Amino acid sequence: QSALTQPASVSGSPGQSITISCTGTGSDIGGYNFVSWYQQYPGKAPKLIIYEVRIRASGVSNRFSGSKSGNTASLTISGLQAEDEADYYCNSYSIHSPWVFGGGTKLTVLRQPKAAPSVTLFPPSSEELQANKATLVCLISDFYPGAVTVAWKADSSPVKAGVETTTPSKQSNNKYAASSYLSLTPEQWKSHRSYSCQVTHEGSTVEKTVAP
Amino acid sequence: TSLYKGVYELQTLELNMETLNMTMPLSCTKNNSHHYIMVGNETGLELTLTNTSIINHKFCNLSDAHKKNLYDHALMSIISTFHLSIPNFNQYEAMSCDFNGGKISVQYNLSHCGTVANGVLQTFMRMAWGGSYIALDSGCGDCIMTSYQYLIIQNTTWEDHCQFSRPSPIGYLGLLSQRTRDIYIS
Amino acid sequence: TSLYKGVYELQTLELNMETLNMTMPLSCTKNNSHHYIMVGNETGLELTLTNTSIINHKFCNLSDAHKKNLYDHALMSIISTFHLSIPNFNQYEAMSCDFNGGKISVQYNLSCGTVANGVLQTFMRMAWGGSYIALDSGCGDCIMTSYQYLIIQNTTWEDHCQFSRPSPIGYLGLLSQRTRDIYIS
Amino acid sequence: GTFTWTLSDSEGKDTPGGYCLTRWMLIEAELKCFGNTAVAKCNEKHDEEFCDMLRLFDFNKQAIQRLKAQTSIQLINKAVNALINDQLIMKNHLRDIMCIPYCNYSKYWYLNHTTTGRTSLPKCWLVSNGSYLNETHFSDDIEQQADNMITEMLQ
C-alpha cells in the first residue's frame, strides 16, 4: 500500500553522469523484473523511457540506462543535457496491485552554483492572537536547485500535525522559494519555550527559532 | 472463485511427477547445498556443493571402472550425460573420481567468466532444473559464480529428499540433446 | 516498379547480418585465397588456401594447449566444430597445429575419398557465402582444389568481407552435423 | 524430428480422443478428465508444454503395462524426441536466463465452463523467482483463452 522510495531530487552538471534510486521490498521490485521509468515534463503526460528494468523504449537515447540490484532499481543518465531536466518516476509489478509508483525525482541540470536557502520564521502577529488564532509562517527563499523539506519542532520535539507546505516555485532571479505554515492555538503557542522551523536543502539543514 | 465472461471458471492442476520414477530420472533439491537425481525407488545420485572436499587424488580411473562392471549402468549413463554436457571443459585436473567397488563418486574442483567453474555450474543449473537458482546466487547474466569450491556427485539411496522443489524429469531430458554439442578436440 | 495483377508491386529487402556480431559468428570471404570468420568486433579467424605452408612439424599438442588456458574459448569452439564436422577423417598426419601462447593456428595438408575431400567439404560449408570461388568444383562427394594447404589462424577484425556478405548460416549448419560422421577411435 | 507419440484411449470413454489424469498423477487433487476437442490440439501444435507432459505420462503408463525390466533409462533415451519438444524446454531455459517468467512444468491453469463442464487446454502457470505469477499478471492471457473457448463452443 506504501509507495516506492525515490530521492526527492538529484542534480548534475551538463555532461556529467547521475543516477536515480528506486527502492522497494521483495513484494515489488525484488519479486519481479518489471520495473519501468517515466519522464514527465511540466504540464505534460509521462513518457515511457525504460521498461522491464533495462530495455529502452523506441527513440529513447542510449544515454539512459536501467539497472536493478536486489530491492533497488536505478536509472542512470550519462552526458547530462538541458533537455533532461524533468521529473522522473519509477513503477513496478506488485503482489498486491498491478502497478506501484515511486514518489518521483526532480532531476536538475545545474546552470547556477548551488544556493543555500534563506530561512525567515515569523511568530503569530498580535492581531491574529487577539482573534484567538496562531500561525507560524516559515518562508524559504533563494535556493537552488528547487527542492527542500521542512520540519517543525517545539522544544526540540517533532511537530507534524497542522503543517502545510508549498511546492518550490521559481523566483524572478531564477532561484526557488517555498513556504511552510504551522497552525496552532494561542494556548499551544504560549505553552512552549520555543518553536523551530528546520529546512533541509541538499543534505544541509537550516534552522530558525522564535519564542513568545 | 474467479470467473471470466460469467461462465468460464479459472481452475488449476499441479502434476505429481513422482509417478514417472520407473521410466525416467527425476531431479530435485533439498536445500542450498544438496540436490538429487532419482532413478527408480531405490538408487539415486546426490549433487552436493561443499567447501569440504571428498577426493584428494587427481586421477579418474574410468577404464578400470568400465572393465570391473560393478557400478549401476543407469547412474553411469546420467553421470556421462552431465560431463559431456559441460561446454568448453579444458582442465581435466579438476575432474577426480573414485569408482572402487561400484561406488561411483565424482568431484569437480571449482577453485582452479570463461573458467571451468562456469561450464560445470551451467550444466548443474540445467540438471537440477527446479531450485538450482538457490545455490547459484547468479541472477541473470553466461557467467555463473558460487562461494562453494567443490561439486561432489555421489551415489545414494532413495529418501524423501525433494523438500524445496518438486521432482521433475525436465532437467535431465534437456541435457540429452545438448549432450556432445560442445566439446573440444582430444 | 513491376506490377502484378495491377495492384501488387514487387519489392525487396536485403538483411544486414553484421549486426548479429555480438551473438553469433559470421563467415565471409575476401578473395579466392582468403576467407574469414568473425566473432564480435575484435577477434576472428582467417581461413587461407595457400600453396605455401606455415607449420612444418606434424604434431598437434592439444592437451598442452587446454591446460595453459590462454586461447580465446570462442575461437577454439569454432576449431572444434570444424574438425568434428569433417567426415571420414582418417589421416591425423595432415592436421598439424601450434597453440603456443594461446595463438591458435591449424594447418591441413591436402594430399575422391581422400582426406582432402572431407576437409574441403567442411570448408565449403563453413564459409557458406563465396566458397564456390575457391572450389572450382561445380556440381558433383568429390571436391578438388589447386591449393595444397588450408591454414586457419587467429586474427583481428577489419573490413574483410568484400566478395560476400557476412552470415551465420554457415556456422549454424555445422553445429547439427558436428559428430555425425566420425570413425571409431 | 518432432513428436509422433499419440495418446492412447481408455475403454470406458464416450468419445474417442479425450485423456484423463488419475488422482495419483495430480498432487492434492482428484482425477480430472479433458475432452477430445482440447487434447486434439496436442497433435497439431508444437508449442504446448502440458501436451509434452501428457505424452510423458502416457509413455510411462504404456511402458509399465507392456514391458518388464530400474535400468529403464535406456528406453526413454531413445524415445525422448518422440514425446516432448526438446526446444520447448530450451525456450523455458532461455526465459529463465533472461529474467523472464518461465514454465517449470508443475502448475497449469485452464478455463472450465460453469454448466457445460467443457475446458480449455491447460496452459502453463508461469513462475518468476520461486513464486507463481498472480492472476493479475497474466489476466489478458486468460481473456484470450476465454475468447477462443467461445468461438470453439459456437462450432
Add this chain to the structure above:
Amino acid sequence: GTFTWTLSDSEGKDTPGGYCLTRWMLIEAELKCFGNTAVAKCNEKHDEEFCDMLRLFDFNKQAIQRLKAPAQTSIQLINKAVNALINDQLIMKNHLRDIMCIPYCNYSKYWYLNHTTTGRTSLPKCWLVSNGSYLNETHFSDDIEQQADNMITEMLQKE
C-alpha cells in the same frame, strides 16, 4: 525438435503480432514493418527462410537488451539456442540445392508483394541465386504469380 522462439512485440505497435526491421538491420534501406497477418505464418510453417532470420534478429536483440554484455563475446548462448530459432534442415535444404546446381537461398535478399494502396505485404520469400548472381524476375515469374493469388485469397478471407 522445432523452433519455439516467439517474436517479441514492441510497445507502440497498433496490432499485437507484427514485426519490424530497423534501418540498421537492412542494408541501403530505411525501416520496414510487416503486418501480423504475414508474420503469423512464421509460427505455422516450418519451411520459410525469412522467418528463421527474424527469430535470429529478435534473439540477438533480446540477448543484448536483457543480458549484460560479455567481456569477450561468449558463443555458448547461441550454441544452446540455435535449434529453438532456426530450422537446421532448412539450411541443409539450400546446401543440397547448391550441390545439385539448383538455384538456392543464401539468406541475404528477399522479395514480397506490396499492395499499392492498402499497404499489406506478403511474407518475404527468399530471392534465389545461382552462380554468384540473383535470378531475374523473369526466371521466377510464376512464383510471384502464385503469391498474388494467395494474396487475393487472404484479402478476401477478411471480408
Add this chain to the structure above:
Amino acid sequence: GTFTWTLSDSEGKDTPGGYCLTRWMLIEAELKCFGNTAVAKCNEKHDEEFCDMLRLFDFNKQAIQRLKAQTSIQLINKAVNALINDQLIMKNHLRDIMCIPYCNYSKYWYLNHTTTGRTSLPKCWLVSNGSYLNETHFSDDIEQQADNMITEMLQKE
C-alpha cells in the same frame, strides 16, 4: 528439425505437384499416380509414413540425375533429416517393442473412386508377427478415411 525437401515433378504432367511411382518403384504392379490434393498433405503433416518414402524415392532420383559417383552414403548421412521424420520410424520401433501392430514401410492401402479416380493418401498397412493385418482389423480406419474423402470431394464443389 523437420523435413524441408519438396517433391519435384516431371515435365510431362497434367497438374503440377501430382506425384507418380514408376513400375520399377512398385513390386508386381504397373505405374500408379496420385493427385495433387493427396500429396499436398505430405508438406503439412509430420505423421505420414508414405510421405517420408516419397521424399526418399524422389531424393534417390534427384541424386542420380544430377550427380556422379558406391560411397554415396556420405550424402544420405547429411540429408536424412531433411527427408524423413526420424521420430516417426522410432515410433514404429516402439510399437514393435510393445507388441503393437507396427508399420514396416512396405505395403500401403488407400481408397480409390470408382469413377473419379481420385485417391486418398496411402496409409501404411500394419503388420503383427510377420503377417499384415486383415481388412477386418483396421476397418474403422478405412471408414474414417472415406469420410475425409467425402468432405474433401465436397470442397471441390
Add this chain to the structure above:
Amino acid sequence: EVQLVQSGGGLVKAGGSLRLSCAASGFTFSTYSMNWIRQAPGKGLEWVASISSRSGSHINYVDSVKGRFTISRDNARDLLYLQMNSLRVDDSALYYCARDRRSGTSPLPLDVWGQGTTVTVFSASTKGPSVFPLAPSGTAALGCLVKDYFPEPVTVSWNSGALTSGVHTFPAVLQSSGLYSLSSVVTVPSSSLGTQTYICNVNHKPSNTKVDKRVEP
C-alpha cells in the same frame, strides 16, 4: 500515431459524482488492458484502477478508492470509463488513462498515456481573507499573511505597486479546513524600517474584498 483522448473533468462538490472518459485512437483497443493513474497537484503519480482486455472480468482498485470508483470499458465505441462517487477532497488530481497488456508471454508496459484531465473537488463556500502583518524583528524581512480564503485567485502588491524590489508572492496552501492561505514578503534594509512605511494591498475579487495592511516593527 497511437493515442488516447480523454474528456470529462471539471468541478464537483465534495460528496458528488463525476464520470471520466478515455477514447482509443489507432489501435485494437479490445486486446489491451486499461489503467487509470492520478497525479495530485505538485505530487507524484498514483495508480488507481485497472481493467482487463476484452471482457473486463479482472478488475483492481486501490484500497482508498474501493466501493467508490468504478472502472468500465465499451469495446464497441472504444471507450474507457471511470465513475467516481462520494468524492472526497483527496480525490482531486490530474487523471490519466494508460494502456498495457497483462501477459505472461508478451507483456506490455504503460506505453500509451492520455493527455490527462483535471478533477477538482471543493468543500467550502466563498470566503473573504483575513490579512495579518508579518512584522520584522542588515536586510530585514516583513510581509503579509492572507488566511482562510476561497476561491483560489488572490493578488498581492506593495505600496500600491510602488514597491517591486524584493517582493515575492508565494503560492497558496489548501489547509485542512478547505480554505486557501498565502503569504507575500519583501526584503528591505533595517535602517529603512523607521523611515519608510510598508503597506501590502491584498485583493480578493470573488469576495469583492480589498484590504490594505501596514506592517510596523
